[PDB]
Amino acid sequence: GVEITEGVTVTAKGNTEGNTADLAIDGDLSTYWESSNDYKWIEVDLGGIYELSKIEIFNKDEAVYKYNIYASEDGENFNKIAYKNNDNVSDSNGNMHTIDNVRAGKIRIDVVQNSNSDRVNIAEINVFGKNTGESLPEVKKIATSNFSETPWATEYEKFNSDSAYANEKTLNEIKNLVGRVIGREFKDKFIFEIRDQLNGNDVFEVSDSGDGKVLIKGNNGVSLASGFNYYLKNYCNVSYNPIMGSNLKMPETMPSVGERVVIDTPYEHRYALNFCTYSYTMSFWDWDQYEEFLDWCAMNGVNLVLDIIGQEEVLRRTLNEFGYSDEEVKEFISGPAYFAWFYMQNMTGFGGPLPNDWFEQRAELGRKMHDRMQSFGINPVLQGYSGMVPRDFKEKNQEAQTISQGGWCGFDRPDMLKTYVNEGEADYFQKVADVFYEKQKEVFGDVTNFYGVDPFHEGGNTGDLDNGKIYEIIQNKMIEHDNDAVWVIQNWQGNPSNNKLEGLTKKDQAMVLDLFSEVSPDWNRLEERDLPWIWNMLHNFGGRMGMDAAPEKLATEIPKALANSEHMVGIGITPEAINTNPLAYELLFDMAWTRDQINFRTWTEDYIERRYGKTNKEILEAWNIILDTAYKKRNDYYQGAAESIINARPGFGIKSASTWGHSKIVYDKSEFEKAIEIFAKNYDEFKDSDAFLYDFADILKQLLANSAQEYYEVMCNAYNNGNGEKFKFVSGKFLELIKLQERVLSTRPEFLIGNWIEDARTMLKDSDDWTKDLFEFNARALVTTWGSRNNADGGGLKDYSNRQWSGLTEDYYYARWEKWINGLQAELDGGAKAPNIDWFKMEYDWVNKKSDTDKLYPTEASNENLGELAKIAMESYSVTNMDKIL
Ligand X SMILES: CC(=O)N[C@@H]1[C@@H](O)[C@H](O)[C@@H](CO)O[C@H]1O
Helices (H), strands (E): how many in the chain?
A: 30, 25
Number of residues that bind ligand X (CB under 6 A): 11
Nearest to 95 by CA among 42, 141, 55: 55
Cα 686 to chain center, whole Å?
32
Q: How many CA atoms lie within 13 A of 745 on its CB side?
A: 26
CB of 128 to Ca ion, least distance (A): 17
Segment near ligand X (CB under 6 A), from 338-346, 463-471, 649-657, 739-747? 338-346
CB of 409 to ligand X, least distance (A): 7
Segment near Ca ion (CB under 5 A), from 117-125, 491-499, 566-574, 847-855? 117-125
State which residue, 515 or 700, has the beta carbon closest to ligand X: 515
Residues of this chain, 799-828, that bind ligand X according to CB under 6 A:
800
Q: Classify the phi-psi angles of 709: left when phi > 0, otherwise alpha if psi is within -120 to 50, otherwise beta.
A: alpha
Q: Is 132 exposed, middle or buried (0-12, 13-18, 19+ CB in 10 A)?
A: middle
Prior bond of 879 cis (ω within 30°): no
State which residue, 23 or 453, has the beta carbon closest to Ca ion: 23
3: partner contacted, choices ligand X, Ca ion, none (Cβ within 5-8 A by kind): none
Name which position in 542, 559, 582, 795 contacts ligand X (CB under 6 A). 542
781: partner contacted, choices Ca ion, ligand X, none (Cβ within 5-8 A by kind): none
120 binds ligand X (CB under 6 A): no
CB of 491 to ligand X, least distance (A): 10
Segment near ligand X (CB under 6 A), from 84-92, 337-345, 716-724, 729-737? 337-345
364: partner contacted, choices Ca ion, ligand X, none (Cβ within 5-8 A by kind): none
Name which position in 26, 502, 671, 759 contacts Ca ion (CB under 5 A). 26
CB atoms < 10 A from the CB of 873, how many?
A: 26
Segment near ligand X (CB under 6 A), from 336-344, 579-587, 645-653, 664-672? 336-344
8 A C-beta contact, residue 839 and residue 847: no
Segment near ligand X (CB under 6 A), from 53-61, 110-118, 340-348, 709-717? 340-348
State which residue, 27 or 424, has the beta carbon closest to Ca ion: 27
State which residue, 25 or 511, has the beta carbon closest to Ca ion: 25
How does DSSP assign 795-831, residue by residue?
TS-TTTT----BTHIIIIIHHHHHHHHHHHHHHHTT-
8 A C-beta contact, residue 191 and residue 209: yes
d(CA 701, CA 703): 5
Nearest to 781 by CA among 458, 119, 335, 457: 335
CB of 463 to ligand X, least distance (A): 22
Name which position in 278, 541, 719, 727 contacts ligand X (CB under 6 A). 541
519 binds ligand X (CB under 6 A): no
CB of 11 to Ca ion, least distance (A): 15
782 binds ligand X (CB under 6 A): no
274 binds ligand X (CB under 6 A): yes
Name which position in 257, 272, 276, 866 contacts ligand X (CB under 6 A). 276
Which residue has the CB atom at the shortest distance from Ca ion? 31
Measured CA angle at 741 (ends 739, 742), to 5 deg: 65
d(CA 405, CA 398): 18
Give the bridge partners for 272, in sequence order: 305, 573
- Phi first, then psi, for residue 107 (nearest 5°) are -135, 140
Segment near Ca ion (CB under 5 A), from 25-33, 348-356, 391-399, 525-533? 25-33
Nearest to 223 by CA among 265, 168, 257, 273: 265
d(CA 364, CA 370): 10
385: partner contacted, choices ligand X, Ca ion, none (Cβ within 5-8 A by kind): none
576: partner contacted, choices ligand X, Ca ion, none (Cβ within 5-8 A by kind): ligand X
491: partner contacted, choices ligand X, Ca ion, none (Cβ within 5-8 A by kind): none
Segment near Ca ion (CB under 5 A), from 16-24, 257-265, 615-623, 781-789? 16-24
d(CA 79, CA 607): 50
CB of 751 to ligand X, least distance (A): 21
Residue 688 CB partners (closer than 8 Å, separation 6+) = 613
State which residue, 343 or 683, has the beta carbon closest to ligand X: 343
240 binds ligand X (CB under 6 A): no
276: partner contacted, choices ligand X, Ca ion, none (Cβ within 5-8 A by kind): ligand X
8 A C-beta contact, residue 217 and residue 581: no
CB of 93 to Ca ion, least distance (A): 16
State which residue, 175 or 413, has the beta carbon closest to ligand X: 413
238: partner contacted, choices Ca ion, ligand X, none (Cβ within 5-8 A by kind): none
26: partner contacted, choices Ca ion, ligand X, none (Cβ within 5-8 A by kind): Ca ion
Burial 456-485 (b: 16+ CB within 10 A, else e): bbeebeeeebebbebbbbbbebbbebbeeb
31 binds Ca ion (CB under 5 A): yes
Nearest to 825 by CA among 700, 701, 729: 729
542: partner contacted, choices Ca ion, ligand X, none (Cβ within 5-8 A by kind): ligand X
Residue 572 CB partners (closer than 8 Å, separation 6+) = 269, 270, 271, 272, 302, 304, 513, 534, 535, 536, 537, 588
Q: How many CA atoms lie within 13 A of 285 on its CB side?
A: 22
d(CA 694, CA 755): 17
Name which position in 515, 627, 870, 873 contacts ligand X (CB under 6 A). 515
CB of 30 to Ca ion, least distance (A): 7
d(CA 567, CA 615): 41
Residues of this chain, 123-162, that bind Ca ion according to CB under 5 A:
124
28 binds Ca ion (CB under 5 A): yes
d(CA 793, CA 780): 17
492 binds ligand X (CB under 6 A): yes
CB of 442 to Ca ion, least distance (A): 47
State which residue, 676 or 781, has the beta carbon closest to ligand X: 781
How does DSSP assign 470-486, residue by residue?
HHHHHHHHHHHH-TT-E
CB of 492 to ligand X, least distance (A): 5
CB of 29 to Ca ion, least distance (A): 6
CB of 827 to Ca ion, least distance (A): 44
Burial 231-263 (b: 16+ CB within 10 A, else e): bbbebbbbbbbebbbbbbebeeebbebeeeeeb
> One symbol per residue from 567 to 606: x for binding ligand X (CB under 6 A), - otherwise; what is it?
---------x------------------------------
State which residue, 110 or 576, has the beta carbon closest to ligand X: 576
673 binds ligand X (CB under 6 A): no
Number of residues that this document lists for the chain: 886
Give the bridge partners for 510, in sequence order: 487
d(CA 682, CA 315): 55
State which residue, 228 or 338, has the beta carbon closest to ligand X: 338
State which residue, 518 or 773, has the beta carbon closest to ligand X: 518
Parallel, antiparallel, or unpaired for β 9-12 and 41-58?
Answer: antiparallel
Parallel, antiparallel, or unpaired for β 203-208 and 124-131?
Answer: unpaired
28: partner contacted, choices ligand X, Ca ion, none (Cβ within 5-8 A by kind): Ca ion
Nearest to 238 by CA among 609, 616, 692: 609
Interface residues with ligand X (CB under 6 A)?
274, 276, 340-341, 344, 492, 515, 541-542, 576, 800
Interface residues with Ca ion (CB under 5 A)?
23, 26, 28, 31, 124
